[PDB]
Amino acid sequence: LHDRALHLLQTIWGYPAFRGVQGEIVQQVAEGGNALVLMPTGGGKSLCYQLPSLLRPGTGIVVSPLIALMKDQVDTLRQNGVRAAFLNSTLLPHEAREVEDALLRGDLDLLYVAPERLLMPRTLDLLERAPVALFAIDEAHCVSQWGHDFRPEYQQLSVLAERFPELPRVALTATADERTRADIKSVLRLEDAPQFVSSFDRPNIQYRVGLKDSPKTQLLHFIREEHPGDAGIVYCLSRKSVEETAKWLQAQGIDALAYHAGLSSTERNNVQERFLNEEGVIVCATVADKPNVRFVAHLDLPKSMEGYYQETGRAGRDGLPSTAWMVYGLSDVVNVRRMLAQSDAPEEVKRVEASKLDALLTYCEAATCRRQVLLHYFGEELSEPCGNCDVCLNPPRVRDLTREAQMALSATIRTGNRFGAAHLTDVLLGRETDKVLAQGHHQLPTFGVGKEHDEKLWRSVLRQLVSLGYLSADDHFGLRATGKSRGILKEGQKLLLRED
């Protein structure tokens, strides 16, 4: 039955019914199923394994790297009535030995365990002789070279599905990169599992991106015209831009404070309180709570879509209207691409950072609703334009390349989703390269159907289709038509570029 969940739901959490897709989620893991759960961070996401752990006999085994964070998940839980504990190598050998006893005696509802502890051959043996309700892999993205913090530990969690096939696995993440969603499925065998996407949308936050032009001038005009005495956060890239901006703001009568990794650990706690407890304070920070936050300003490009979402997301936590306002230019993209180039990072990190940036730039350049593009990155599809973003409200002039997008998508399909942008372009142009003649492509009916345009436009159309996920690359430069391709091909969706 589904309703014992509800009795525990509000006898413990205090919510009268599930939110969005969580009812579906809790039922699937409680009836012994597997699951892929993608949600913004929050105690609603924790509900998805904590509640099933209460519903099924035995202990939920929660895998997480945040061992520093850990000790207040049990503290939170041990006053609701729930029994939970921590197992990791920060512990003394007697203490480690008594959580184990407690585990073996069916005394815990939840066991939080660092990957380091879990993957030890000894630890996996205890589990075999302990009453286990499930495995929850939190922050599942870590298995991936792509999505966030890779960890060498995390891609060994292969083993849960091996040594414990019969026990349910639910993997939950807040960073749902599309290459990363795919890689989690592979490590924890959830290819065959349902994948659940709860909404990332924050409807009350209006999204704006625009061109940098005297950014300190632009900002002040924004703050006075639209958020005169309200609490806001202004993010800057460097510790020096925080300092100087913070006192530039003070100079114009705005109660601004600096907040960075740098100076004193007392002021930092001091700055938090002034923000947390007073009204109309603006904090300037690099990367690093208040229910009352009316805007988030970006005066430089964030490092990623993940970061941008978490940062803008600190706004409007009281459900009321808030603005996310960002300007970038010129030099911001150049400065970034130069650092990627002079970075001493490993090959895959250079590969990840380049698509991170491509993703972000693609969002910055949206010719249609920004929100749709943003939410798509996290695997959420918003059917209709939102009506609360600068693109929606002030539509830019667009070039329609829908017809060309269709030609391109068919071209890659009748050639088997394997040739590269340049080759496809040859076919489109009706050029009898020898690579072409070798595959017979010279008299497919699609050959030269694109002779109308030159080489430069097609490569452009192709990047655009790649960036928006109508094509998928990482075949090694071969382009595959994705499922999303039906949109342009059959369901009337349009490909629009900014007129620029």
Q: Is 27 annotated as a binding residue?
A: no
Which of 397, 456 has the CB closer to Zn ion? Answer: 397
* Residue whose CB is less far from Zn ion, 366 or 409: 366
Contact region for Zn ion (CB under 5 A) — 5-13, 153-161, 282-290, 385-393?
385-393
For the bound state, the minimum distance from the C-beta of residue 385 to Zn ion, rounded and expressed in Å, comes to: 5
- Tell me if 439 is assigned to a ligand binding site: no
In whole angstroms, what is the distance from residue 201 CA to residue 375 CA? 7
End-to-end CA distance of the chain: 58
Query: Rounded to whole angstroms, how far apart are CA atoms 227 and 322?
Result: 9
| Gap between the Cα atoms of 495 and 401, Å rounded | 5
Cβ neighbors of 39 (< 8 A, separation 6 or more) are 45, 48, 172, 173, 174, 197, 198, 200
Q: Which residues in 183-335 belong to E strands, given as ranges?
A: 195-197, 205-211, 232-235, 256-259, 282-285, 295-298, 322-328
Residue 17 among known ligand-binding residues? yes
Residue 386 C-beta: closest distance to Zn ion, Å: 4
209 binds Zn ion (CB under 5 A): no
Residue 497 Cβ, how far from Zn ion at the closest point, in Å?
17
| Residue 494 identity (one-letter amino acid) | K
Check the annotation: does 469 bind a ligand: no
Of the candidates 371, 376, 423, 441, which one interacts with Zn ion according to CB under 5 A? 371
- Establish whether 44 is an annotated binding residue: yes
Number of residues that bind Zn ion (CB under 5 A): 6
* Centroid of chain to Cα 243: 29
Nearest approach in angstroms of CB 208 to Zn ion is 10
- 170 touches Zn ion by CB under 5 A: no
The reply, when asked if residue 142 is annotated as ligand binding, is no
- The nearest distance, CB 297 to Zn ion, in angstroms, is 19
Structural contact between residues 313 and 233, judged by C-beta atoms closer than 8 angstroms: no
Q: b/e per residue, 49-75, with b = 16+ CB within 10 A?
A: bbbbbbbbebbbbbbbbebeebeebbe
CA–CA separation, 377 and 360 (whole Å): 10
Figure out which of the listed residues 26, 369, 405, 495 binds Zn ion, where binding follows CB under 5 A. 369
Q: Is residue 364 annotated as involved in ligand binding? A: no
Rounded least distance, CB 11 to Zn ion, Å: 40
Strand runs labelled E in 59-201 = 59-63, 84-87, 110-113, 132-138, 169-173, 195-197
Quick one: DSSP state of residue 484? G
Task: Please name which of 306, 311, 339 lies closest in space to residue 326, comparing C-alpha atoms.
Answer: 311
Is position 46 annotated in a ligand binding site?
yes
Query: What's the closest the beta carbon of residue 487 comes to Zn ion, in angstroms?
Result: 17
45 known member of a binding site: yes
Which of 74, 392, 401, 429 lies at the binding interface for Zn ion (CB under 5 A)? 392
Q: In which element (H, E) is residue 425 found?
A: helix 421-429
Among 133, 299, 389, 409, binds Zn ion (CB under 5 A): 389
The answer to the question of residue 386 lying near Zn ion (CB under 5 A) is: yes
Residues annotated in a binding site: 15, 17, 19, 22, 42, 44-46, 369, 386, 389, 392
**Contact residues: Zn ion, CB under 5 A:** 369, 371, 385-386, 389, 392
Residues annotated in a binding site for ADP: 15, 17, 19, 22, 42, 44-46
Residues annotated in a binding site for Zn(2+): 369, 386, 389, 392
